[PDB]
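Q: Could you write out the predicted structure for this multi-component system? I'm mainly interested in how the pieces pack against one another.
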Amino acid sequence: ELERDCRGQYLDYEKEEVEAQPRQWKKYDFHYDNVLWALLTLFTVSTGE
Amino acid sequence: FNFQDETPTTNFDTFPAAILTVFQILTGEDWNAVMYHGIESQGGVSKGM
Amino acid sequence: YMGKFHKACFPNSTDAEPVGDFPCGKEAPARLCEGDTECREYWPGPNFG
Amino acid sequence: SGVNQLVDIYEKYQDLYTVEPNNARQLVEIAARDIEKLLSNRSKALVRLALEAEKVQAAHQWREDFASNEVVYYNAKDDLDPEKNDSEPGSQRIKPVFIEDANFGRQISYQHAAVHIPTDIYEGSTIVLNELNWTSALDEVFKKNREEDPSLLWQVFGSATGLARYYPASPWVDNSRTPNKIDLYDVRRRPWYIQGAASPKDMLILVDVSGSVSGLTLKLIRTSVSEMLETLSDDDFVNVASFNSNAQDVSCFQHLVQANVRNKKVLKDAVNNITAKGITDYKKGFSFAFEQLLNYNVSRANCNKIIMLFTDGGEERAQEIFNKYNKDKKVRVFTFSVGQHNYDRGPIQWMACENKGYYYEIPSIGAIRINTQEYLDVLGRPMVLAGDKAKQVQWTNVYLDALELGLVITGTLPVFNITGQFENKTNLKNQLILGVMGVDVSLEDIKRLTPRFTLCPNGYYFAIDPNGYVLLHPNLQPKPIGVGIPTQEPVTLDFLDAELENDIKVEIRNKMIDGESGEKTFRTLVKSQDERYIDKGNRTYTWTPVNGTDYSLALVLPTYSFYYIKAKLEETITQARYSETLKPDNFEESGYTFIAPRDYCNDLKISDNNTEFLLNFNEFIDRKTPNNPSCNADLINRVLLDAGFTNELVQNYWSKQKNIKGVKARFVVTDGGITRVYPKEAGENWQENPETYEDSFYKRSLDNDNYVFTAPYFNKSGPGAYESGIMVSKAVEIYIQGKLLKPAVVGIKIDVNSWIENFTKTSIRMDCVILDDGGFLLMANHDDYTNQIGRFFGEIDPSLMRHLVNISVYAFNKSYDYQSVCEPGAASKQSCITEQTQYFFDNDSKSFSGVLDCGNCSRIFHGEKLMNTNLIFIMVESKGTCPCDTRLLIQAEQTSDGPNPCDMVKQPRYRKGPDVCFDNNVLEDYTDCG
Ligand SMILES: CC(C)C[C@@H](C(=O)N[C@@H](Cc1ccc(OCc2ccccc2)cc1)C(=O)NC(C)(C)C)N(C)Cc1ccc(C(C)(C)C)cc1
Ligand SMILES: *[C@@H]1O[C@H](CO)[C@@H](O[C@@H]2O[C@H](CO)[C@@H](O)[C@H](O[C@@H]3O[C@H](CO)[C@@H](O)[C@H](O)[C@@H]3O)[C@H]2NC(C)=O)[C@H](O)[C@H]1NC(C)=O
Ligand SMILES: *[C@@H]1O[C@H](CO)[C@@H](O[C@@H]2O[C@H](CO)[C@@H](O[C@@H]3O[C@H](CO)[C@@H](O)[C@H](O)[C@@H]3O)[C@H](O)[C@H]2NC(C)=O)[C@H](O)[C@H]1NC(C)=O
Ligand SMILES: *[C@@H]1O[C@H](CO)[C@@H](O[C@@H]2O[C@H](CO)[C@@H](O[C@@H]3O[C@H](CO)[C@@H](O)[C@H](O)[C@@H]3O)[C@H](O)[C@H]2NC(C)=O)[C@H](O)[C@H]1NC(C)=O
Ligand SMILES: CCCCCCCCCCCCCCCC
Ligand SMILES: CCCCCCCCCCCCCCCC
Ligand SMILES: *[C@@H]1O[C@H](CO)[C@@H](O)[C@H](O)[C@H]1NC(C)=O
Ligand SMILES: *[C@@H]1O[C@H](CO)[C@@H](O)[C@H](O)[C@H]1NC(C)=O
Ligand SMILES: *[C@@H]1O[C@H](CO)[C@@H](O)[C@H](O)[C@H]1NC(C)=O
Ligand SMILES: *[C@@H]1O[C@H](CO)[C@@H](O)[C@H](O)[C@H]1NC(C)=O
Ligand SMILES: *[C@@H]1O[C@H](CO)[C@@H](O)[C@H](O)[C@H]1NC(C)=O
Ligand SMILES: *[C@@H]1O[C@H](CO)[C@@H](O)[C@H](O)[C@H]1NC(C)=O
Ligand SMILES: *[C@@H]1O[C@H](CO)[C@@H](O)[C@H](O)[C@H]1NC(C)=O
Ligand SMILES: *[C@@H]1O[C@H](CO)[C@@H](O)[C@H](O)[C@H]1NC(C)=O
Ligand SMILES: [Ca+2]
């Protein structure tokens, strides 16, 4: 839960077979980090999708 | 809704969760996923439709 | 559309769970699949059937 | 066969050798001294390494910037490609030059130590980078240790941050970068690290199977309990309880049982078979836990009492249960909040505080592996505070090495954090160990300190744990121990399961565990090597404790094996005229020669392809004189003496005759290694092991002072029985100075047709069968039984087999093989416990008659045991009668489950636990509930 920690690799048990995946510090698709991004996020919320 | 491998966030366990789930079904978005969960909870398609 | 969502293409006679959550067909216009798989009967269907 | 000719040849050359005694007492004392010297050498290496690790971590300065000062190290999971772009910001990677070494069998670099960092651990964080910085002194002391003792195998620092730094730099096994080969190795789960990180436990896993744990929580709880059990050694005692308004055992065990492979499997099955239902009650569960930890009627390790609570959360603290049962705070309580939920986690975190424990969270699979290592991190606080009384070398059970070397035992020593010491500071985390240092001792390295070739092929050494497991035994194979029916554990094979179990052997095992010394001569059922016969042996066990360790060494020695022939070959020409017989160009006057692939000289490499080894042996014999200290003279002297005697037999008695109608092959096998089979035609049909000490018939024919016929294998794809024959052998029994010593076996491979014609020749003067020991049809008359020659007679007509057993002419012993490969069924090949049986002559009587009461019919038989052999003739006259073929007596290595563990823990085998253990210190700071 920090960008310092979120480096290297990790074991993913999602596939039901262990697989090593990279650790990526990502941002969500609709993310409110601006009044232009918040407008788009709120528009997509208002359309219901 | 305590399924194997997962527990949905849109569940009817407590009152805040139930009230939010009913609100989300009212707005119309993804009511079908909650329907599938509520059918699988009452036994399989076999006996809970 | 009766009973058309039940042919999923399964591994090579291993009797394991089918690969992919989509119906298939052994015919020409339907969705073929790939990777040593056989489009055979008895898959409950999409969305738990 | 010419027993007499080989005999009088042997007495004809008393001036060519000397007969020497096998004083078993001195042999055991010498081997025990050698083994204690080896283990003390490894202990000294460990002490050096641990001292330097503590000193060099005491003088370390913490940092957060490694860009300005890179750390240079070799990462084990680096690809051999010269990739300049495979470096972390704070670390520059070494690219080593790898040579191939004989000791290790892998690429080995002596110039630096390698490092293993688990995939789930980032290899450039601050903790990892600091550890990689201060372990370079460990690298240097690795070099020094290997420089003072060139026989060292892997010597390793198992860091508590996840790292592992072993000295001979070798690439990780198969898991560097390979699809479907994921690297789940973690040093802190390894048996040697688990062993050296703390003292033996008394767990009791309380699983909270109530209603609120259904779904994902129960999945994570059962996986977590499995992974918790996978961190318990054989010195640890554990039971698993489960409570939902009522506490009960999850399995058939009613108390704390030892945490060995079988019991751990039983507990794992019980936990996997568990279901969630009902209301929680934290008082009736902890009452059960504290009551089961108050049981002292059962065997235990009276140390480190623990309770592992696998719940999710709740609003119940149960203060009064703890104040009643745990008031002196003798019992820890580690609480685990498993699952992804929003229940209250306050009482869960409080039970750990008021009971010296710790609180762990397991939100999802992937968090399971780390928290078990972490309670073990907690348990080592009392060990740290005991400064130098806790630094003692301990050796683990026999296990299979990671960097594949075969079977090894690791000697561990923990490393203490000593930053603030004699200059006392806050000493925040000075209660945790830095890691554990281990050094591996190869089991084949222990085998070389117990020379076996001066003994009979029936005499051998074996060592033992305090738990009774064998450090060293002829029946210990490099395979994992089977635990049930197939559908990184240690190789823990008990002494009573590596052999046949009498009561005298239980007395001997108990005496060895206690560390006493003594001798015992008695009569033993010795199972043959092919696991198909049982002979009535004559043994003499002598044992001593190995001083300075927990091991106890013993030497099995047959009564006739008290003397051995010492070859007096010092003429340098007589050995040459013996040697000239061995090139594979004279295999027409002398027999087809095979040589035991022994360690005659180190420059010879043993080969599975025997004639290759024969060629190099001849080559080295061609120029042998300058290689005086290169190798042992005794082995080559004896093998050449035996080759000469065998040649004198094969020319002066076999080459004068050249042909007998009945025989198909004439062979002689000698303890030196010579096994010349005469015709050179059946030598292609010869399928016996080149090493004579592993020849089943040779070992069988020495205890049995008579003729032994080995029935060929049935339905085996190869040379078969018709075109090879059937084996016949008797052992020479020469006397020198009035002493009984048996140096060799001669034999005949009698042809099947030349016997069947003579057997049916006299029929004018149909059902007639010949049976040997073990009830195998050697040959018959009906000519359809002879189709199934060598096959077990019980498979032919099992009714007569059962009845003939009922007269008690054939006794049988059913035992277990825990190290056998196994075809997996349904609910490549896994390993199971196979349940092999062997038959033999119950009584010594010679004539047997009776009536077979077949169902609604009657059958008559007469049995006569041929004098001076292991055969019985059965005259039964009944074919195609009413069907009494209900079942079969299948003498075969049958897949089975082992002995019922729920019944074997109520009368457990005697076992001596570790003496000193560290728990419940008063200086320990409990205010770290996490
Ligand atoms: C109810 C229907 C008859 C008409 C209804 C509609 O079509 N909604 C969409 C879903 C939706 C919702 C919000 C959207 O963002 C525009 C917005 C945002 C906030 C408030 C008002 C408008 C876009 C799409 C729908 O699901 N349509 C189906 C036919 C049922 C499939 N819109 C709202 C009428 C409308 C649209 C645009 C405007 C202007 C702003 C003046 C241009 C004015 C009026
Ligand atoms: C079935 O076939 C022949 C039957 O003639 C068996 O060989 C004979 O065995 C008898 C046993 O008592 C011998 O007397 C026969 O002659 C012996 O030959 C040896 C050869 O070294 C002499 O030293 C003896 O003094 C004696 O004369 C012997 N004859 C032959 C030709 O072998 C044969 O053993 C038997 N088959 C099997 C498999 O045993
Ligand atoms: C062995 O014990 C010593 C001390 O008992 C450990 O050294 C100490 O480690 C802590 C980190 O847990 C250091 O605190 C850190 O300091 C840096 C810089 O001041 C700061 O940026 C961090 O936020 C954190 O506060 C501490 O300085 C360091 N030294 C002392 C004297 O306390 C050591 O880590 C232990 N060994 C291992 C292998 O962890
Ligand atoms: C393995 O094979 C050996 C073959 O000797 C078996 O040992 C024999 O077992 C029988 C059956 O229990 C013993 O007979 C019993 O003798 C006692 C004492 O006289 C008598 O009271 C009983 O009524 C019964 O007749 C026999 O003595 C014993 N042999 C020896 C030398 O002690 C053994 O049972 C087989 N199985 C195992 C697991 O070892
Ligand atoms: C780095 C900042 C760039 C942000 C551009 C994002 C595009 C957002 C489009 C906004 C759409 C608004 C719809 C609702 C208007 C009332
Ligand atoms: C397993 C297949 C057959 C199971 C029996 C039929 C169950 C489906 C019928 C119920 C559907 C409920 C929705 C009705 C909406 C009008
Ligand atoms: C082990 O020590 C005991 C007593 O210290 C001694 O009697 C015995 O000979 C020793 N054994 C060896 C192999 O040194
Ligand atoms: C122990 O080490 C010494 C020198 O360090 C060596 O001479 C001796 O042979 C070693 N012992 C064994 C059993 O290898
Ligand atoms: C730790 O790092 C510093 C700077 O790179 C280096 O001088 C020092 O030798 C390192 N410690 C050890 C034990 O090598
Ligand atoms: C163990 O498994 C069997 C078979 O699934 C089941 O019938 C039994 O109830 C299980 N044990 C418990 C205690 O539930
Ligand atoms: C142990 O044995 C004693 C006496 O044999 C008995 O009273 C007690 O119930 C047994 N069990 C425990 C747990 O003490
Ligand atoms: C060994 O065998 C001899 C005869 O073969 C027998 O008299 C003796 O009792 C046996 N040894 C033991 C310990 O019984
Ligand atoms: C064994 O080695 C010899 C000598 O090189 C060779 O002729 C023979 O083919 C080899 N046999 C096998 C099975 O490798
Ligand atoms: C032999 O068979 C009888 C009945 O068929 C049985 O009672 C007995 O146990 C068997 N074994 C012996 C050694 O008598
Ligand atoms: Ca509950």
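A: Regarding packing and overall arrangement: Residues 15-27 of chain B form the longest helix (13 residues).
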